[PDB]
Design an enzyme around this catalytic site. Structure first.
Site, PDB file in Angstrom:
ATOM      1  N   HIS A 101      47.272   7.826  57.689  1.00 11.23           N
ATOM      2  CA  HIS A 101      46.117   7.353  56.925  1.00 11.23           C
ATOM      3  C   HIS A 101      45.814   5.864  57.170  1.00 11.23           C
ATOM      4  CE1 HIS A 101      47.857  10.840  54.930  1.00 11.23           C
ATOM      5  NE2 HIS A 101      46.595  11.226  54.822  1.00 11.23           N
TER       6      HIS A 101
HETATM    7  C1  SMA Z   1      53.945  25.241  48.066  1.00 11.67           C
HETATM    8  C2  SMA Z   1      53.017  24.046  48.231  1.00 11.67           C
HETATM    9  C3  SMA Z   1      51.754  24.091  47.773  1.00 11.67           C
HETATM   10  C4  SMA Z   1      51.253  25.222  46.857  1.00 11.67           C
HETATM   11  C5  SMA Z   1      50.859  23.034  48.178  1.00 11.67           C
HETATM   12  C6  SMA Z   1      49.573  23.149  47.874  1.00 11.67           C
HETATM   13  C7  SMA Z   1      48.601  22.170  48.294  1.00 11.67           C
HETATM   14  C8  SMA Z   1      47.373  22.631  48.198  1.00 11.67           C
HETATM   15  C9  SMA Z   1      46.093  21.927  48.531  1.00 11.67           C
HETATM   16  O1  SMA Z   1      45.033  22.897  48.474  1.00 11.67           O
HETATM   17  C10 SMA Z   1      44.970  23.551  47.171  1.00 11.67           C
HETATM   18  C11 SMA Z   1      46.015  21.184  49.911  1.00 11.67           C
HETATM   19  C12 SMA Z   1      46.419  22.128  51.065  1.00 11.67           C
HETATM   20  C13 SMA Z   1      44.524  20.709  50.121  1.00 11.67           C
HETATM   21  O2  SMA Z   1      44.173  19.664  49.130  1.00 11.67           O
HETATM   22  C14 SMA Z   1      43.128  20.173  48.234  1.00 11.67           C
HETATM   23  C15 SMA Z   1      44.185  20.198  51.550  1.00 11.67           C
HETATM   24  C16 SMA Z   1      42.670  19.879  51.594  1.00 11.67           C
HETATM   25  C17 SMA Z   1      45.032  18.991  51.968  1.00 11.67           C
HETATM   26  C18 SMA Z   1      44.266  18.155  52.939  1.00 11.67           C
HETATM   27  C19 SMA Z   1      45.139  17.407  53.960  1.00 11.67           C
HETATM   28  O3  SMA Z   1      45.674  18.096  55.070  1.00 11.67           O
HETATM   29  C20 SMA Z   1      46.457  17.416  56.025  1.00 11.67           C
HETATM   30  C21 SMA Z   1      46.988  18.093  57.103  1.00 11.67           C
HETATM   31  O4  SMA Z   1      46.765  19.509  57.253  1.00 11.67           O
HETATM   32  C22 SMA Z   1      47.745  17.441  58.029  1.00 11.67           C
HETATM   33  O5  SMA Z   1      48.330  18.167  59.157  1.00 11.67           O
HETATM   34  C23 SMA Z   1      47.428  18.226  60.287  1.00 11.67           C
HETATM   35  C24 SMA Z   1      47.975  16.113  57.901  1.00 11.67           C
HETATM   36  C25 SMA Z   1      47.460  15.387  56.836  1.00 11.67           C
HETATM   37  O6  SMA Z   1      47.733  13.944  56.704  1.00 11.67           O
HETATM   38  C26 SMA Z   1      47.988  13.281  57.984  1.00 11.67           C
HETATM   39  C27 SMA Z   1      46.684  16.056  55.874  1.00 11.67           C
HETATM   40  C28 SMA Z   1      46.157  15.393  54.777  1.00 11.67           C
HETATM   41  O7  SMA Z   1      46.356  14.222  54.631  1.00 11.67           O
HETATM   42  C29 SMA Z   1      45.397  16.045  53.826  1.00 11.67           C
HETATM   43  C30 SMA Z   1      44.858  15.247  52.660  1.00 11.67           C
HETATM   44  S1  FES Z   2      49.061   6.106  55.990  1.00  9.32           S
HETATM   45 FE1  FES Z   2      49.309   7.951  54.801  1.00  9.32          FE
HETATM   46  S2  FES Z   2      51.402   8.610  55.121  1.00  9.32           S
HETATM   47 FE2  FES Z   2      51.195   6.654  56.126  1.00  9.32          FE
END
Ligand code: SMA
Ligand code: FES
Ligand code: HEM
Ligand code: HEM
Ligand code: HEM
Ligand code: HEM
Ligand code: HEM
Ligand code: SMA
Ligand code: BGL
Ligand code: FES
Ligand code: SR
Ligand code: SR
Lengths: 256, 428, 179, 179, 428, 256
Positions: free
Chosen positions: C144
């Site tokens: 980020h």
């Molecule tokens: C068991 C664990 C559980 C239930 C977790 C649930 C989370 C649920 C969320 O959705 C409900 C979440 C997926 C959703 O946020 C709304 C996405 C838009 C997140 C967006 C997202 O993706 C990234 C990503 O894919 C990456 O790799 C290529 C790398 C990333 O940073 C470098 C990110 C990242 O910085 C963000 C903000």
């Molecule tokens: S700038 Fe987001 S994890 Fe380092």
């Protein structure tokens, strides 16, 4: 094969209120290390559990020290190094020696009656006893029927039931005559083969009794936890039952 | 189809919700259905089953989070859960003994039905669906047992995949397919995991319909006499609202059951199981004491009763020009033993619903039960005499009951007088 | 009256109790298993490290940076004034919890050559690209866009803290004991 | 008339076609992967085998029995009218598919010392117990109680065939080539 | 709630079946519902979604049969599927591109709704449920991406588990819990597998209710004008039976879609994805070009717009006594950006349903769309100038639209004249 | 880091009707073996695939023979042995040399324009090209700006974009001046370092072009299968679409 006799030893951990005996388990670990480990192993037992509560409960330092005797191929390095409590005991040294990790759960000593398993229902599965028996079960003199036919490399055992038996000891139908059979495990015990610190008696009878109990823990480390969980569950329910019962009776009483 | 009255929104939230999605209404109609007053303790099994389904699914998903479906790890994977995961030991044991409880239940559930004509019209669909569930359950339960990858696990798999190799012609194809190869190996394990996961949901789905169906015909009672459908007045005399009357009884029972259940899981978790599965699977050795899961024993018994030396077998082998030998016969005998049970709504010709009013029926019914028990008992014994015989008579009686006795009794029996109404009986 | 009502409330009570007793373990099972909870202490031979070199090592599953700083590096670190920093805390476990992000409080030695810290961006998690990168001669987290200076202090971006320094110390001449 | 009806039937037709084209691969994926399909041919050193000893070896994931029979064993094998056997076929891949279950057709050597076959019960799958067990001095499959004689022939139980003998041959003096 | 004609049994099997389990009736009422004649192409997305759900589940279950959830194997596990399983390569690619199709669809589905007031009463429940689905989908899709255990997989996980570490107080706890340890490791992978499997069924379940709900209010059309509920007569004038009219165009469209879909999966399967995930996961190195999945970019954009240098952030930080710093703000900004969209039924005050008749609305709406696109586009760019700004204005406009514009336009706008009937429009 | 330039080589397999060139792939395998394999590996590539259809398609015997060069460590045994076609090529020899198994896929060569990925949309990801370029990209003379600061052990490369660069070559803002950067891989090719059987030219240009194509197959062995699957799927649908279209048009025509 089939099933046989097993001395019914009254171990401390049996019964719903049973619990391991810390010292015994300790003595056991000594027997395992000084004698059994030579050929057997415990690949599913993490050494550091020697420390965990409800078992031998040894001081982390001792454990850390103990773990040092083993030599282990290190995960990344590939080279060797002293053992850390984060390592499991090693695999059996002797190729055909079974792993003792789950032995006590892996063997039944009480069978029937009539193949109704009602004997287990009151005596348990008897794995530790069986183990006990096997250790105890090495007689000095082979049973007469096979007085000149002892397969080489084997030894008659009163409790072992899956070993081979000299034809000279099978009845008209191939069934064996002997109480036991021939095992590939040379008698390991021998009165006072181990020096217990506190001087506790090292009679082959004792050692076996102990190492078993140890091996029982080795296989069911979370036993006590399990049983404590038990009481609890029963309590909630026994109560909840009584309450729910009245609740019910009362509600239905209002219709008939 | 009984008279009553439907939910009606009271709160604003309710009136708002109802005009859009009457989901609360549905729940109501489901939990408020009028139910015969006379229902006894043999009706609690349905819920005991429900509970089991959930129990199994949650503890399952959990376990799934620590298990590794792959030969080299799989078994270690499970000991890990036992020795390391927080309360892993109690979860494993719960899932396993959960299966037993699950079956203990269905057998009671099943026999309850057979005895009270709960399968006789109009309850046919219910019965069939239920059978589907039964099949699925077993299907599932089998794969599950495979996962730990221990002795009983491997061989058991080897054998069950074998049953398919018994089908003539296609059979070898079908088997290689299930195994994903020449022998039971990783590929098999892996696919079983995926399916062990999947099935329970399918079950869940059927269970829905199961309920939907018995909800569409009203429940059956110990007298086999329907509820009076002419007036809200007399109907109420025959019934009481499900909630809270039964909902409580259910919970009450549910408690007692769990009491005993936990007692087992707490004090003797390894009772109902095979000691040989604490032995890592060995592809080069079949344990001398290999025995199936008690809840399979009876069907196992039947299958091995039929050896190449059984007359019927021979007759059969003869007539079929070899095609139906002992192997395949045994297989047919087994799936057949189940299949007949499914057709029971059609083999039972008697028009008297409750078996409480069939003097002759009672006799063969209890023999059936006794048999089922015996059958189980023998699967645990050797193939030697007198067992071989016992198993034979046993299997024999089984089909006897469905294919002959029931059909006959329909015309021959002189049935007793069933009360005129449930009310009548209740008051008694 | 409240004869039956008492029962009803004593009942529902036990119910709830049990219900939770179930829920907890279903939850707790997810917490760290006894094998994961084996927090070791590793040892790092740092003899082959010339100045201007970063040594990346695994520990507790996350990376750990071990840089032997250049003069150039040590300079800039000491140039910067506490109040220009985004994070004032040294985030150093070896020293007091109140310490200040002075370049002197970020190193292990007095000469300020040995910078040891968790190569774990405090924003969301990544391991920031080192080798004197970013607007401040430090590290740049590509996840980020967070910048860190030659002392491992956050200077720009969403990150809210300077890279933490774990318990560490030289056990001898060419060996550091993380943990 | 059948102007529109034709279309409707030409359509539903293509539909079905596709539908199946989907189903097949969903099914076929379960068949043996290209890695399993690596049917090797192993080699077994049999020098350390005294008579009266069975050697159990893995191959294609199933066990393979290699017994060096005793005289006692070889005797009984030859002491049985083929007409008394349940399976008449030798089930021997080394020889003709029409061969007869004569003990002579079950061994590799003419002396009958070397009995090599799949330790895979023909009933449902298990690996039958050895050490001369059963009712016919052979093997006993504990899975459903099937008996095999000293030549590996089924004599009692649900099993419908004699243990198959796989392609096998001595490649030399103390080595057999299964496959 | 429209005037149609119910199901009546014809065949004997039917009458027999209906008196016991009216499952055929239900299916009928579900497939026979009267639907506005004017529906355009923007209504096909619902089905396209349906298909995706099934596609994903079957290909999923299949893949699950070859995959190994465990760090040491996992990645190999997948290449294995690619190189060995029969048609494995085509299945993998299908499941993956399946996800993209799946999202491309929902966004179209979503925007379609925003533009036509499909969230506007009485369709509130529908909308909320839909949102739940949306959440679930993403949650799922995330864990899925983790499985292959490649670079983007690891780090992505590291970061998403991180978002929870952002919550004040509990946050660290919650995070350690998700990870099952101090860092993203096996334990994490393993639990994600169990959940990646589970969720889709939960989705499936919601999708049911989703349908159940829009079935309870009737579908919405491009004019926002309801169907006449006074007489079967005029109702038929406004509608046509779902079957076969729509059932067909659905299939028709469904085909066209799949045509393009397969084209991609056939010819450019790796287009929509990140090259870095063909790199085995490395715990000590974050790829310099780490970028999220396009279908996440916009929400990603928003989250990183807010750096410790943003005025509002600062204000915020100060006023909250530091509790709400950049990090957490960014997190809040993101989930918030979604949350507002869920509250849209309440932020839109205009009583005119269809947006086709809101001259001012139309402007901000299309800006919203343009924004969403831009937002996505920027998440793919660096944190440097002018992007940082663009992202900021973009994020800004987003909330602007839901929290301000819509509420205002409700009182300010001068709405056009919506036709009197669907019929009227149709004939046009 | 960032993105850079990559020579646009017109490989035989690009385009919807593209297909590997058996011989090229073969030549490639030779380059890989004779040169690359020295440091790199292909741990996810089962040797026996050298045989499978749609790739080099070598005769099982040759393969079996080829596999022999590799000194594998047996699964059970633990000792060593010759390589069987059932073995995967070995891991990279050189610790820091990446595995080329998926290389042709783990890289993009065509980026943008404007970060819109429209360049990939028409040229593909460009992994093979990138690889190509990297091999081609070692110039004789370092770029001027770093005329006396070449880090020891690295080599300037016109295509590699993630290497380090001498401060003397960064602009006022740290950005790099050079087209490429410093790679840790010493130039691997050299005109005629491999003697192609059929005598084909072994110009560094060719070799690179080939070994790439090989590496492309190595990573996407089922490419052709995939594409053939393609046409098919399209056909069914293109038709099914037309039919369904009419079917629709006709059904609706009966209302409006
Ligand atoms: C068991 C664990 C559980 C239930 C977790 C649930 C989370 C649920 C969320 O959705 C409900 C979440 C997926 C959703 O946020 C709304 C996405 C838009 C997140 C967006 C997202 O993706 C990234 C990503 O894919 C990456 O790799 C290529 C790398 C990333 O940073 C470098 C990110 C990242 O910085 C963000 C903000
Ligand atoms: S700038 Fe987001 S994890 Fe380092
Ligand atoms: C007091 C320490 C020992 C204990 C508690 C112990 C326990 C056991 C047990 C329970 C079995 C398996 C019994 C069964 O199969 O049901 C066994 C088998 C065996 N033990 Fe040990 N053993 C000990 C020492 C040894 C030693 C020192 C050796 C090596 C000299 C050894 C060699 C073997 C072998 C080879 C077998 C398997 C042979 C067979 O199956 O007949 N044991 N032992
Ligand atoms: C998933 C396991 C099952 C569950 C959860 C389940 C649940 C239920 C429930 C709750 C009832 C109503 C209350 C009761 O009588 O207990 C019921 C009734 C019944 N079940 Fe099941 N059941 C299951 C399996 C089966 C099976 C395997 C059969 C046998 C084919 C079956 C046959 C029936 C029948 C015939 C009824 C009577 C309904 C009536 O009175 O109309 N069920 N079941
Ligand atoms: C009809 C409900 C289910 C039944 C009857 C069932 C039954 C079983 C059985 C008998 C076992 C072997 C237990 C043992 O070790 O003795 C098992 C294991 C397992 N089941 Fe289930 N299962 C059910 C649902 C589930 C579900 C929904 C999951 C989630 C995928 C699941 C996951 C597992 C796992 C991972 C194991 C292996 C670990 C172990 O228990 O030893 N099961 N299951
Ligand atoms: C909403 C439904 C689903 C979505 C959106 C989804 C999405 C994904 C995604 C995006 C991946 C990563 C693709 C890649 O490797 O680059 C994936 C992988 C995977 N999914 Fe799913 N999935 C879904 C349902 C399922 C289901 C139901 C199962 C289990 C029955 C499943 C099993 C797998 C497996 C084993 C992988 C790893 C192999 C692979 O990545 O191709 N998926 N999924
Ligand atoms: C599992 C993914 C989903 C599926 C399969 C699905 C399916 C459908 C279907 C078939 C319809 C009816 C035809 C149409 O107008 O599209 C529908 C309507 C609708 N969907 Fe979805 N949907 C999904 C997700 C969503 C999401 C994420 C939202 C946005 C929160 C949403 C909002 C709506 C709305 C508002 C309608 C209009 C209903 C009406 O006219 O009463 N759906 N959906
Ligand atoms: C993908 C789907 C698949 C593969 C489905 C498979 C379904 C199988 C059947 O369900 C219909 C099956 C479970 C059910 O037959 C009705 C049982 C009564 C089978 C009975 C059964 O169990 C055994 C077993 O458990 C063993 O291990 C300890 C060992 C066994 O040999 C001794 C047996 C065995 O001899 C038999 C007959
Ligand atoms: C209704 C069921 C009541 C069950 C009471 C069970 C008492 C079980 O008591 C058993 C012993 O019999 C057994 O030997 C040990 C082995 O560790 O474990 C105990 O829990
Ligand atoms: S599998 Fe051998 S007796 Fe049945
Ligand atoms: Sr005792
Ligand atoms: Sr090109």
């Amino acid at each position: 094969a089939g099933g046989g006799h097993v001395e019914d030893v009254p171990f401390s951990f049996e019964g719903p209120f049973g619990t391991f005996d810390q010292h015994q388990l300790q003595r056991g670990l000594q027997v395992y290390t000084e004698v059994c480990a030579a050929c057997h192993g415990m690949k599913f037992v993490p050494i550091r559990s020697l420390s965990e509560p409800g078992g031998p409960e040894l001081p982390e330092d001792q454990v850390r020290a103990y773990a040092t005797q083993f030599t282990v191929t290190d995960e990344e390095t590939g080279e060797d190094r002293e053992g850390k409590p984060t390592d499991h005991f090693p695999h059996s040294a002797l190729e055909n020696a079974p792993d003792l990790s789950l032995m006590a759960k892996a063997r039944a000593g009480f069978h029937g009656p009539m193949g109704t398993g009602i004997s287990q229902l009151f005596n348990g599965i008897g794995g530790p006893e069986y183990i006990y028996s096997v250790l105890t079960g090495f007689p000095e003199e082979p049973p007469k029927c096979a007085e000149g036919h002892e397969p080489d490399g084997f030894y008659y055992n009163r409790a072992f039931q899956n070993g081979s038996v000299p034809d000279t000891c099978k009845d008209a139908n191939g069934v064996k005559t002997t109480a036991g059979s021939w095992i590939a495990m040379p008698p390991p015990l021998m009165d006072d083969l181990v020096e217990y610190a506190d001087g506790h008696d090292a009679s082959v009878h004792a050692m076996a009794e102990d190492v078993s109990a140890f091996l029982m823990w080795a296989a069911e480390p979370k036993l006590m936890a399990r049983k404590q969980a038990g009481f609890t569950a029963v309590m909630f329910l026994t109560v909840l039952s009584v309450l729910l019962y009245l609740t019910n009776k009362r509600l239905w009483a209002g219709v008939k | 189809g009984i008279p009553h009255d439907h939910y009606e929104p009271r709160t604003g939230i309710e009136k708002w919700l109802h005009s859009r999605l009457p989901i609360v209404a549905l729940a109501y109609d489901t939990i408020m259905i009028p139910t015969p007053r006379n229902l006894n303790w043999m009706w609690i099994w349905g819920v005991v089953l429900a509970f089991c389904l959930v129990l199994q699914i949650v503890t399952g998903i959990v376990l799934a989070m620590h298990y590794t479906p792959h030969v080299d790890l799989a078994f270690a994977s499970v000991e890990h859960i036992m020795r390391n995961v927080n309360g892993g030991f109690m979860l494993r044991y719960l899932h396993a003994n959960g299966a037993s409880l699950f079956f203990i239940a269905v057998y009671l559930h099943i026999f309850r039905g057979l005895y009270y004509g709960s399968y006789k019209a109009p309850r046919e669909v219910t019965w069939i669906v239920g059978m589907l569930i039964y099949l699925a359950m077993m299907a599932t339960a089998f794969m599950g047992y495979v996962l730990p990858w221990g002795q009983m696990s491997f061989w058991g798999a080897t054998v069950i995949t074998g049953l398919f190799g018994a089908i003539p012609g296609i059979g070898h194809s079908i088997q290689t397919w299930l195994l994903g190869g020449p022998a039971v190996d990783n590929a098999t394990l892996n696919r079983f995991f995926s399916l062990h996961y999947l099935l329970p949901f399918v079950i869940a789905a059927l269970v829905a319909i199961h309920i939907w169906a018995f909800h569409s015909t009203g429940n059956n009672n110990p007298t086999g006499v329907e509820v009076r459908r002419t007036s809200k007045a007399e109907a109420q005399k025959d019934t009481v609202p499900f909630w809270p009357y039964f909902i409580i009884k259910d919970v009450f029972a549910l408690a007692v059951v769990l009491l005993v259940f936990f007692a087992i899981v707490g004090f003797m978790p390894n009772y109902l199981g095979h000691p040989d599965n604490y032995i890592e699977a060995n592809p080069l050795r079949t344990p001398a004491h290999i025995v199936p899961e008690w809840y399979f024993l009876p069907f196992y018994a039947i299958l091995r009763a039929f050896t190449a030396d059984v007359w019927v077998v021979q007759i059969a082998n003869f007539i079929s020009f070899g095609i139906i030998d002992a192997k395949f016969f045994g297989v047919l005998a087994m799936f057949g033993a189940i299949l007949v049970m499914a057709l029971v709504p059609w083999l039972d010709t008697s028009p008297v619903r409750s078996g409480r009013y069939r003097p002759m029926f009672k006799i063969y019914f209890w023999l059936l039960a006794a048999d089922f028990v015996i059958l189980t008992w023998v699967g645990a014994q050797q193939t030697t005499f007198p067992y071989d015989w016992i198993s034979l008579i046993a299997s024999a009686y089984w089909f006897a009951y469905f294919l002959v006795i029931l059909p006959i009794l329909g015309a021959i029996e002189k049935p007793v007088a069933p009360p005129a109404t449930i009310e009548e009986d209740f008051n008694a | 009256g409240t004869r039956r009502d008492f029962l009803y409330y004593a009942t529902a009570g036990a119910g709830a109790v049990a219900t939770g007793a179930a829920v907890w373990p279903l939850i707790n099972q997810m917490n760290p298993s006894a094998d994961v909870q084996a927090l070791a202490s590793i040892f790092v031979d740092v003899s082959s490290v010339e100045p201007g070199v970063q040594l990346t090592v695994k520990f507790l599953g996350k990376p750990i940076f071990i840089r032997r700083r250049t003069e150039a590096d040590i300079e800039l670190g000491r140039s910067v004034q506490l109040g220009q920093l985004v994070d004032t805390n040294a985030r150093n476990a070896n020293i007091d919890a109140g310490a200040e992000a002075t370049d002197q409080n970020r190193t292990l030695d007095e000469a300020g050559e040995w910078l040891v810290m968790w190569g774990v961006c405090t924003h969301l998690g990544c391991s920031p690209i080192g080798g004197v990168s970013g607007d401040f001669g430090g590290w740049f987290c590509p996840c980020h866009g967070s910048h860190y200076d030659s002392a491992g202090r956050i200077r720009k971006g969403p990150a809210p803290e300077n890279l933490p320094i774990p318990l560490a110390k030289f056990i001898d001449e060419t060996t550091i004991q993380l943990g």
